[PDB]
Structure 1
């Protein structure tokens, strides 16, 4: 038989290991020849594996690279302008790679050029609440200062935006061992911790879903009209550079001015963590000087798009996609995910060669330039938006398969909760101590739902990965799953070697998953989801699960507003319409579910399949969210404070955020009311897509 079990059993840990090794021997930086060569390799192999068609889709997008003959670095400069300390020009390469060429040195992609000199202010994680603390509570002024911030907690681009709006003239990002050195584990190469010379690369854009900075709304094809750099989307206005904790210690050790306001501001270095501004008495005349010379350059990128045509519904697309480009070797990010996709394609192709075809079309994607702001997935979705809007069933992401080895981590639309629960109950746990138990059982035990006993946690989708255009722009049901760590407060901070030269094949094979069993488990979850979506007669979505969360989000946003009872009285701020719509959705979804169970009629089936496919679509508002036109989903958006985090009822959330500080409360509460109306309306309209059609 050619069923899900046949598919799943064909998947091999040994193959995932071979592919991971193959993808991580040299760097695959977006826009470089090495990454174009790997694209052509994957294209050839997917053809060999059996896909019907496999094409490269290329675009010319704005990328950013250091100047090879004019290196970026930071100094402490004394009174006469002598540079008395310089940060490192490169990370010491790991064992056996010390002769590898084309390792991009640490830099912040899309930083402008500059050589700002000034006094340091330490801003903790550079979160919105950290700047509130500095400015409002401590009366410390960042204007014209160079800010130094530790990585962690939120996307680095949010830190840079926050620093810019505080009036900073530069930002230094560093990795504190508090966040990137787990106690009792050794530094790379002898363990998975970050050494003091290690540095996290990464882009610092604030694109809000736009894709290539120069072509928002339209694919960056051969005839594209491009904005001028001054009108580009999302570029930072101040120089930015990342450093390791040996270098950070040198910049922080001399810091004076105010003490840290409390212990949540102190990392693990042997320094005071004084906020500044500037250095203590002896060194009061020394300054910090950045030297940034990176350039932004329009550069060709390449997505690989493979098609396995559906036997029955070829015009319905289930998409498995993840990126290929890496900062350096990409041993975890992304090749641990790319190797899983490769093995999934191989397994599906094995069935296809024996005469099987899925019910619906499956599209497989190897995206490029993800690290530079989700550019390859976004430009391709811009190009194909009409096809995706009317035909897209679901998008399953496939970046890093592991970021730890503790338990499963799933983020997805409520429409996929039931699918995930059911599939994980049928898969074996790879975990020690759970042998012969289901993955559902180990996951639920290790990651309990905060709301329901006997259920696992499933998180909301925000952004920071390639599902963003499909979910938040186009409203296609999306999901992701990976293995993760225990480390709760590190959720958005990355594993220690994230985006460093030390993230290698050996890191994975020695320290994360020597048997490739966690990789195989993730291949089973991702491939199992794709299989069910592409093959189930009735699409495997449960609208009632959306009803349950919508009530939870409505309770939560109302609870936020209810911290301001006098203003809700004054301005007549009612959530009644939103609860009404949520009640209606619950009622209608229950009735639709009964019909879906109670309905030989392919037109009624597909009618119902279309109602299921278009339900996520119905949460899209064509006018988008305020000042974020490419975030169009009304129930979820990336947090305006942290792109990695999903926020629910984002339009109402942002209207309420820090509202007590607004100068015109009438206007501010009027906008809360407007957002309640938009949310109630959209929930009701989505409900009505599930009513009988005529």
Structure 2
């Protein structure tokens, strides 16, 4: 019988004798780069990962085939041109090498107005309106899809994206880069249902698809455009001195995008190590395999970590006597550059099989981007599991423990649209976690042809040790989630969350008071949820771990916690991110808070009936989660 200390020490022992840089550099060889989704080299790497899973002697290795629609470049070259309104002069600024997938193919001409990052606050605090004009923005703070959506919400006709040198210190000013502008995840032409032949692909377009052209440009093209623009950019933007705000009266910009749709076959590779007690429950470990360019940091690191973790855990199970109670799934996704298409379509295809069975997802994408900071974004149910992991895993350089801030949990930022763990958490209700060793700046070569092994090993000379530390974090997550009879999922954490929610409501007391509404029911639901969590902990304490059935019942009550926060009053097809805490849409608590915020700022944007329905549905979602966690239906003390 092995306990936690033996498993941790054996994990570290096997991590010491593992060479990550060799596998990363192998994934950067010419037979695997570049590997755009659906390409021949993407399939070659998929076959390599599949055969490696087979050589690891996993419990079962299989694959999934999807036919999804991506967007690629046309024979017609996209162009950014400057036209003089004195019809006598036109100037070709750039024929960009990169592009933004799912952009609308169109040609637009108008003024060019500079927005700082494309955020809502950047647009609102702008002197010049953007309606009817082309917008140029820097990348770095929000996804391309969010920038394009915010620009289109104000009737902008086009979006240009560039990388300034201050935020992206790249020597090559003509470097191209790639992105996508779909405000969502998965195949945008099969929204809410799997991209399988069984559906016969009916006509359906995701509502997150933009309706304006968007194109990426180099810093040199951005400076050429600034040469024809006026007005200094604000000092708090902290950008280059060449930055300008609006084009001159005589100059307009013409943007031509002609990208074309392409139906491709993508492969999702899977391996499973079956559990020893409850093999029907499992953790999922995933990593993105595809990449526009070489994708060393964006895709190679994660795939190498996946391979090494699968190999190490198979060796621990076959030779070291590691007996996980629950199963472990290792997944190599494809089409991740287009919005986690493979993982989202797998979730949409097998939701009926994953329901209350897959209880944790661990993402490995971009886990090594630097060495200064260790950042994590996860559901609160994993926070404790993260903390205990940070308290005994050492930093690859300094040698200190990762746990240095005791208030780290209050500074965790929620998962974003571009993270593969976001559809796991917000759509399927599976607790998900993403982590990375990174810097305060963004990795400058993401989505570019400079994301190679040379740049990664040069910027991070200790790449092997940092990859080993990331693999140690992931392996300790997996062991803690699969080794014991308890799941190590901390439901009590959500109590804190609920508190914050009602505290966020306090700043609007008068509004709640002027609409004839009360917050008493929210506090009563908070009390009920606290009571349910306290009695669940008490029952775990008073139960005997050898009694398989009492533990099974309590663990089922634990596994229903995240699912009960998915909004049961919303269509999963049109609003797949149903999680009221971490999703998107009018059913979430942040949307309720923003709608209530619009009532103080007395414009006509506040919708009172929508706010009343939001409050009712959120209140009963919380109360029903508390009731379900409290036990049997007849043991609910409500009156």
Using the alignment, how far apart are the partners of 1:626 and 1:61 within structure 2? 20
Displacement after TM superposition at 1:29 (Å)? 1.0
Q: Relative to structure 1, is the Cα distance of residues 45 and 65 closer, same or farther in structure 2, using a 3 angstrom cutoff?
A: same
Task: Provide the residue aligned with 2:280 in structure 1.
Answer: 315
Using the alignment, how far apart are the partners of 1:153 and 1:17 within structure 2? 30
Out of 105, 116, 124, which is 1:132 matched to? Answer: 124
Displacement after TM superposition at 1:286 (Å)? 3.2
Task: Provide the residue aligned with 2:193 in structure 1.
Answer: 218
| Partner SS for 2:107 | coil
| Residues 322-364 of structure 1, C-alpha deviations (whole Å, 9 max, x = no match) | 2111121111102212211111001011123326442111111
Using the alignment, how far apart are the partners of 1:254 and 1:503 within structure 2? 32
Displacement after TM superposition at 1:45 (Å)? 0.4
| Cα RMSD after superposing both structures | 2.5
Using the alignment, how far apart are the partners of 1:340 and 1:513 within structure 2? 17
Task: Provide the residue aligned with 1:197 in structure 2.
Answer: 174
What TM-score does the superposition give when structure 2 sets the normalisation length?
Answer: 0.91
Task: Provide the residue aligned with 1:339 in structure 2.
Answer: 304
Using the alignment, how far apart are the partners of 2:171 and 2:177 within structure 1? 10
Task: Provide the residue aligned with 2:45 in structure 1.
Answer: 38
Using the alignment, how far apart are the partners of 1:232 and 1:496 within structure 2? 30
| Partner SS for 2:125 | helix
| Residues 176-220 of structure 1, C-alpha deviations (whole Å, 9 max, x = no match) | 223222xxxxxxxxxxx463222331101112x5x2112122211
Task: Provide the residue aligned with 1:76 in structure 2.
Answer: 82
Contact 1:175-1:199 within 8 A present in 2 as well: no
Displacement after TM superposition at 1:627 (Å)? 9.9
**1:187-586 pair list within 5 angstroms:** 193=170, 195-207=172-184, 209=185, 211-228=186-203, 231-256=205-230, 260=233, 262-265=234-237, 267-271=239-243, 273-274=244-245, 276=246, 278-279=247-248, 284-354=249-319, 356-432=322-398, 435=399, 437-441=400-404, 444=405, 449=408, 457-485=411-439, 487=440, 494-559=442-507, 561-562=508-509, 565=510, 567-586=511-530
- Name structure 1 gaps, 5 residues minimum: 90-104, 182-192, 452-456, 641-646
Q: Is 1:616 the equivalent of 2:562?
A: yes
Using the alignment, how far apart are the partners of 2:537 and 2:381 within structure 1? 13
Using the alignment, how far apart are the partners of 1:303 and 1:12 within structure 2? 30
Displacement after TM superposition at 1:396 (Å)? 1.1
Using the alignment, how far apart are the partners of 2:599 and 2:72 within structure 1? 40
Q: Relative to structure 1, is the Cα distance of residues 383 and 628 closer, same or farther in structure 2, using a 3 angstrom cutoff?
A: closer
Using the alignment, how far apart are the partners of 2:238 and 2:7 within structure 1? 54
Displacement after TM superposition at 1:424 (Å)? 2.2
Using the alignment, how far apart are the partners of 1:362 and 1:300 within structure 2? 26
Contact 1:215-1:224 within 8 A present in 2 as well: no
| Residues 237-273 of structure 1, C-alpha deviations (whole Å, 9 max, x = no match) | 11111112121011012213x665x4334621324x2
Q: Is 1:587 the equivalent of 2:527?
A: no
Displacement after TM superposition at 1:515 (Å)? 4.5
- Name structure 2 gaps, 5 residues minimum: none
Q: Is 1:649 the equivalent of 2:589?
A: yes
What TM-score does the superposition give when structure 1 sets the normalisation length?
Answer: 0.84
Q: Relative to structure 1, is the Cα distance of residues 8 and 58 closer, same or farther in structure 2, using a 3 angstrom cutoff?
A: farther
Q: Is 1:629 the equivalent of 2:635?
A: no
| Partner SS for 2:92 | strand
Displacement after TM superposition at 1:152 (Å)? 2.4
Out of 156, 167, 185, which is 1:179 matched to? Answer: 167
| Partner SS for 2:449 | coil
**1:19-34 pair list within 5 angstroms:** 19-25=23-29, 26-34=33-41
| Residues 582-635 of structure 1, C-alpha deviations (whole Å, 9 max, x = no match) | 222122211211111111311100101111111111111233389952111112
Task: Provide the residue aligned with 2:13 in structure 1.
Answer: 9
Task: Provide the residue aligned with 2:139 in structure 1.
Answer: 151
Contact 1:13-1:520 within 8 A present in 2 as well: no
Displacement after TM superposition at 1:150 (Å)? 1.5
Task: Provide the residue aligned with 1:101 in structure 2.
Answer: none
Aligned length: 622
Which one is further off, 578-587 or 52-61? 578-587
Using the alignment, how far apart are the partners of 2:232 and 2:173 within structure 1? 25
Using the alignment, how far apart are the partners of 1:638 and 1:232 within structure 2? 14
Contact 1:333-1:400 within 8 A present in 2 as well: yes
